[PDB]
Amino acid sequence: MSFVCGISGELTEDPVVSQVSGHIFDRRLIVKFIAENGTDPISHGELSEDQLVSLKSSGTSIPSLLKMLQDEWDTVMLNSFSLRQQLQI
Amino acid sequence: MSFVCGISGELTEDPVVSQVSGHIFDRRLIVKFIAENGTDPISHGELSEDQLVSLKSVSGTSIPSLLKMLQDEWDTVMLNSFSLRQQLQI
Amino acid sequence: MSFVCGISGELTEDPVVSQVSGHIFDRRLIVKFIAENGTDPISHGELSEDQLVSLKSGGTGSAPRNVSGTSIPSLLKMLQDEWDTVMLNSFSLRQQLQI
Amino acid sequence: THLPVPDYDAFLTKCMLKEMDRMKKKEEMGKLDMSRCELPAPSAVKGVDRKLWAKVLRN
Amino acid sequence: CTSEIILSKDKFTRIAILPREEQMKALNDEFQMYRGWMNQRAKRAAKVEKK
């Protein structure tokens, strides 16, 4: 099924939920969040990697997929800039 | 958000997760299951009332999905090239 | 520790060994091979996904960046040029096998 | 007869087949356009297109 | 507002109220500012890269 990561807001291939808040994450981001910040990202309570519960569970052209990456990367960086610009405003 | 209840396939309004399976259930079903059988219908685990952790929670194909697409294509190119090396060395 | 996959020849972050061969593999590759052929890729012994022993020791360290690999578009450019050489290699093999 | 016949297309996807057939027919690979780093300004005859201006700033 | 508000004639204004040619000049200068910020970074990057 479709699952949305709380950190990225993207559809995730590996949805995991934390017992300290009940928000779903991509495993890889929340582990890196825990490994950097220690807290739950939403409830700010103490969290640890063992408190994470795993949820249940085509290709077209490589020149096309590389161009989908290029355009998608520019969108991610555009967002990051607008956040820094909006935060100063 | 909204979720599908793993007991029955209906929409979920009080979502909780089965810790032994990751399946999402509606509280109104799994609680009586815990009362009457203590298990879950697919994984057949052992589960208890305290394990019902509740859930409380873009347009493009996200970068990790596209990198997995490239990694999947790479895996086929490698598995092909291995077979061709295997034939060529013989 | 450091390991290389017998199938791909690359470093692997998930080294695994079959019980029916001495050779070591990247798990997702050998599983995909088994999913087609049901056999060890090198010894041709019959093989199943549960006959795989996993090295929990730490996988190979990351390859250092090139200075051209310090920017995302130049990584994508580098990935494109890398990919073309990989496909030309795969195409060269099927020609060499015919010869 | 003592050796198998090779399946040169083992494991390949429907995508990778067409990519093999491109280089098999000897056509060049596609390349990414990299002019986005230089980003030319628009001219006076394209500045009427508001989207075409935003697409420059967003770049 | 963060897209609607741009400076023109040395003052902050709505974008839609300006004459069209003044909108083009404003958007040109807005773009040229970003191109300045890029070039200020690219020179710093090339300096470290060359080392």
Curated annotation (Swiss-Prot), chain B:
Q: What happens when the gene is disrupted?
A: Enhances sterility conferred by rnp-4 disruption. Combined with emb-4 knockdown, leads to accumulation and leakage of unspliced ama-1 and tra-2 to the cytoplasm, severe growth retardation and arrest in larval stages, and loss of interaction of rnp-4 with pre-mRNA and spliceosomal U snRNAs.
Q: Where in the cell is it found?
A: Nucleus; Nucleus, Nucleoplasm
Residue ranges constituting the U-box domain according to the UniProt record: 1-63
Family under the similarity heading: Belongs to the WD repeat PRP19 family.
The record's subunit annotation is: Homotetramer. Component of the NTC complex (or PRP19-associated complex) which is associated with the spliceosome.
Function per UniProt: Probable ubiquitin-protein ligase which is mainly involved pre-mRNA splicing and DNA repair. Core component of the NTC/Nineteen complex which is part of the spliceosome and participates in its assembly, its remodeling and is required for its activity. Together with emb-4, necessary for interaction of rnp-4, a probable exon junction complex component, with mRNAs and spliceosomal snRNAs. Plays a role in nuclear retention of unspliced mRNAs.
Q: What is the protein name for this chain? A: Pre-mRNA-processing factor 19
Q: What organism, scientifically named, is this protein from?
A: Caenorhabditis elegans
Q: What is this organism's lineage?
A: Eukaryota, Metazoa, Ecdysozoa, Nematoda, Chromadorea
Q: Which residues of the full protein are shown?
A: 1 to 99 of 492
